[PDB]
Design a protein around this ligand. Structure first.
Ligand SMILES: CCN1CCN(c2ccc(Nc3cc(Nc4cccc5c4N(C(C)=O)CC5)ccn3)cc2)CC1
Length: 895
């Protein structure tokens, strides 16, 4: 068909990988995933056509609302008697004139009641009685929608107006909302039909695992493509282990050593486990190792290549017969000989070290037992032997179980406690937050001990998403656990929180055993029913496509997404093209013209930016940082190479929106090629979570988690904060330690003075507690910035996990000379003390978020010691008073 071939290449352009290359893969799991995932695409497309045209606009322009309509009390007090002033704009088609209309309404009106008060005010002197304020008001509030002035963000749903993020921040930032009436038909007329078509690539005995009573053995035949130095390497062998999510189910078993010239073994390795006792997520982890002989020094075993296999395939079949596994290059850092956390499957580069294996064939297909059999074997032998009144808990015992629940992902559960948790597993359903710890108590190489945990999980009470995510990290491989976790996310995870957590959730996809699973079908369905989520879903996947360990998985997931995302694929292709130009341009500035004057680089830049193909690709597309922002014409006179390390580009676009003057008229984005911005995305994620934790508890410590998006390999975008300056720029205007204070006095004269100091004090207090916990390094005068209104914020988070200068406390003390002894300083301290204890209450959240990214390859997130720094700064090994004591110490150390 013709219309399928044009879509195949547009999907390929967006992914960067030809779709035909996916037709050439013969792995039945790959072709079954490609075919079976389309059920999520039809479910999503069907959802978009339910209440069309509204449901279709809901997909393209979903409500950008907070997780809850409830307002913190100090935010409601910012309102007048619970009401908000709102300016509503109407465009009068003759002259396209902008008529304004200022309203005052309850913060909890839904959009259509705000539309009502707008027309009652548009005709407020039009001689209309009560019998005429129902002919025009009742008809128009069904024909109009509210749009944010200056961007493509709409209020298409009956949420409380103040629950919309744009309105929530206007309430908190003291600004006034500017909205605009739009005819429903004006918006609906701009939504295509998105006719999703099913692609053309759609359309003997079995025995139980538990009857195959016999020990496990695996044959290691030979290895090809093993290129080593014959002059120094002595022998070669295959190291092997059976692992369940990074934990060994039995002792590792090497092969015999052979000369590095003849890598053949023809050996059956036997393992200390029984085949019925293999868990569902059982994995074979092997690697080829060299041995070098040294006089006086011990032999050194260096791994040469690694690989992991699933003992069961995606159809629950215990694997039998011969197979060839292509292995992977050794990660710089892996100091063991096996890589159990590495992805599973044969390296797609088939010209790499290849290991041939063989599994036993037990006369027929062997499959894992279904829940029916598991239940029967669980209810049976649950009390094979059976002091039943002693396992009854006492107040001391129950509490201990709760104390174990408070522990973070990195805590160690002693063997004493693991047998405690397991024996009292029938009580644990009363405290569902113990489930992560109770799951680690299982001896997963025991089908009886596992069949019973499957039974407690089948009817386990749901838990909060922040804890359900813990069960999705790589140390919980079992599909029953991960299905429970995903079910908890489907029921309790709002869209707002999903968006904030999407980085970790896409990252953890790479640890999943199989292509088709409940997490990927959850994430895909939400990406295909909410285009704002689908947009970042796309870029978190695309930006990782260069990693060969995941590029096949993410390439297939992107294929299914691009087939069903609708007309947005064209917009994404415009963003992909625009970014490739910037990637190819800044790569020249980093290779060829790297040592030339900025004069020479700019001339090359202006000249290249003036070519026809370039101006077409980089004008008239959506900002990857926020697709609600349209990037129109590129105002080249304001573009410049900056004076930072990687020579980032300062790019300036006109905002083509009609109301641009009410939000921002020029959109400025920093394109940076050279630094892993995933590392900065994670920091700004945390800073945003710390702000929400503080607001919901009464601390208006205003942070600035500015936008930041990784689009590829050490390439990405950074939102420019407007009306802000670094301390370098402030101090150079007039150095003295009172230049900062004097600069804010000039910018905040009169009544605004005390507001600027308060804003600077609350924002400064937020950033001292955050930068201390997170260990932000390299804190010099260009990394801290101040806004004209006094808001302080940091800006370079390329260093974390291993700062109160004088002229900061001068601003807090309102210019006093004994800054360490003023009362204004006493409030600064108590804000920090309260802010520290609020974060410490959520240590599990912030530790989980790092732990899930530990395998992502971030330069400064390489080991548990990096994460343990937060276990130290948060003082999780002490009491609250002893922890607040700790924080007080470095506060006194900080000048
Ligand atoms: C102290 C142990 N205790 C503490 C709790 N614990 C635990 C295990 C795993 C994870 N999560 C994880 C871990 C991931 N990698 C790794 C897992 C295990 C070791 C290392 C990993 N490294 C990298 C670079 O890859 C560094 C070395 C990737 C994604 N997620 C979280 C906690 C095990 C028992």
């Amino acid at each position: 068909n013709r219309e399928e071939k044009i879509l195949n290449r547009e999907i390929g352009f967006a992914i960067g990988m030809p779709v035909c290359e996916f037709d050439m893969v013969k792995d039945p799991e790959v072709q079954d995933f490609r075919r079976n995932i389309l059920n999520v695409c039809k479910e999503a497309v069907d959802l978009r056509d339910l209440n069309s045209p509204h449901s279709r606009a809901m997909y393209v322009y979903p409500p950008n609302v907070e997780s809850s309509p409830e307002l913190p009390k100090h935010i409601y007090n910012k309102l007048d008697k619970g009401q908000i002033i709102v300016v509503i704009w109407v465009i009068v088609s003759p002259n396209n004139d902008k008529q304004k209309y200022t309203l005052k309404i309850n913060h909890d009106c839904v959009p259509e009641q705000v539309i009502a008060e707008a027309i009652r005010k548009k005709t407020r002197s039009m001689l209309l009685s009560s019998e005429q304020l129902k002919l025009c008001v009742l008809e128009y509030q069904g024909k109009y929608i509210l749009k944010v002035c200056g961007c493509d963000e709409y209020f298409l749903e009956k949420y409380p107006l103040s629950q919309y993020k744009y309105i929530r921040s206007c309430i908190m930032l003291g600004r006034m909302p500017n909205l605009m009436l739009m005819a429903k038909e004006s918006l609906y007329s701009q939504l295509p039909m998105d006719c999703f078509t099913m692609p053309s690539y759609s359309r003997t005995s079995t025995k139980s695992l538990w009857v195959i009573n016999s020990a496990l053995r695996i044959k290691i035949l030979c290895a090809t493509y093993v290129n080593v130095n014959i002059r120094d390497i002595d022998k070669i062998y295959v190291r092997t282990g059976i692992y369940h999510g990074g934990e060994p189910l039995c002792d590792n078993v090497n092969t015999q050593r052979v000369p590095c010239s003849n890598p053949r073994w023809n050996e059956w390795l036997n393992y200390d486990i029984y085949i019925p006792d293999l868990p569902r997520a059982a994995r074979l982890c092997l690697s080829i190792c060299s041995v070098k002989g040294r006089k006086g020094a011990k032999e050194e075993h260096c791994p040469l290549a690694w690989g992991n296999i699933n003992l069961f395939d995606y159809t629950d079949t215990l694997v039998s017969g011969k197979m060839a596994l292509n292995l992977w290059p050794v990660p710089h850092g892996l100091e063991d000989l096996l890589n159990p956390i590495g992805v599973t499957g044969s390296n797609p580069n088939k010209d790499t070290p290849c290991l041939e294996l063989e599994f036993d064939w037990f006369s027929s297909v062997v499959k894992f037992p279904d829940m029916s059999v598991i239940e029967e074997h669980a209810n049976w032998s649950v009390s094979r032997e059976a002091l039943a009144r002693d396992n009854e808990l006492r107040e001391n015992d129950k509490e201990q179980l709760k104390a174990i629940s408070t522990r973070d992902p990195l805590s160690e559960i002693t063997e004493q406690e693991k047998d405690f948790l397991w024996s009292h597993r029938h009580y644990c359903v009363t405290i569902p937050e113990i489930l992560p710890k109770l799951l680690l108590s299982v001896k997963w190489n025991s089908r009886d001990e596992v069949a019973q945990m499957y039974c407690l999980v089948k009817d386990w009470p749901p838990i909060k998403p922040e804890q359900a995510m813990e069960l999705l990290d790589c140390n919980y491989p079992d599909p029953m656990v991960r299905g429970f976790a995903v079910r908890c996310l489907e029921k309790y995870l709002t869209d707002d929180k999903l968006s904030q957590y999407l980085i970790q959730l896409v990252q953890v996809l790479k640890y999943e055993q199989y292509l088709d699973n409940l997490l990927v079908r959850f994430l895909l369905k939400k990406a295909l029913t909410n285009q704002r989520i689908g947009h970042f879903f796309f870029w978190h996947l695309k930006s990782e496509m260069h990693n060969k360990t995941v590029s096949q998985r993410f390439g297939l997931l992107l294929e299914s997404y691009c087939r069903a995302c609708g007309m947005y694929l064209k917009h994404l292709n415009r963003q992909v093209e625009a970014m490739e130009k910037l990637i190819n341009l800044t790569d020249i500035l980093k290779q060829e013209k790297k040592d030339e004057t900025q004069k020479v680089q700019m001339k090359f830049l202006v000249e290249q930016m003036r070519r026809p193909d370039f101006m077409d690709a980089l004008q008239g597309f959506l900002s990857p940082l926020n697709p609600a922002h349209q990037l129109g014409n590129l105002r080249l006179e304001e573009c410049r190479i900056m004076s930072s390390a990687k020579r980032p580009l300062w790019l300036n676009w006109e905002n083509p929106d009609i109301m641009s003057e009410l939000l921002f008229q020029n959109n400025e984005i920093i394109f940076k090629n050279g630094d892993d911005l995933r590392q900065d995305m994670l920091t700004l994620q945390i800073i945003r979570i710390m702000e929400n934790i503080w607001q919901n508890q009464g601390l208006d410590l205003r942070m600035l988690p500015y936008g930041c998006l990784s689009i590829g390999d050490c390439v990405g975008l950074i939102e420019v904060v407007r009306n802000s300056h670094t301390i370098m720029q402030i101090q150079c205007k007039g150095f003295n330690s009172h230049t900062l204070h004097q600069w804010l006095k000039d910018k905040n004269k009169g009544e605004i003075y005390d507001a600027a100091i308060d804003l600077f004090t609350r924002s400064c207090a937020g950033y001292c507690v955050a930068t201390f916990i997170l260990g932000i390094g390299d804190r010099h005068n260009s990394n801290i910035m101040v806004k004209d209104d006094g808001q302080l914020f940091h800006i370079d988070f390329g260093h974390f996990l291993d700062v109160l200068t004088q002229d900061f406390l001068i601003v807090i003390s309102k210019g006093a000379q004994e800054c360490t002894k003023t009362r204004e300083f006493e409030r600064f301290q108590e804000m920090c003390y309260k802010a520290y204890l609020a974060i410490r209450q959520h240590a599990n959240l912030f530790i989980n978020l790092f732990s899930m990214m530990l395998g992502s390859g971030m330069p400064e997130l390489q080991s548990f010691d990096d994460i343990a720094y937060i276990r130290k700064t948060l003082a999780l090994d002490k009491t609250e008073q002893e922890a607040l004591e700790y924080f007080m110490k470095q506060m006194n150390d900080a000048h």
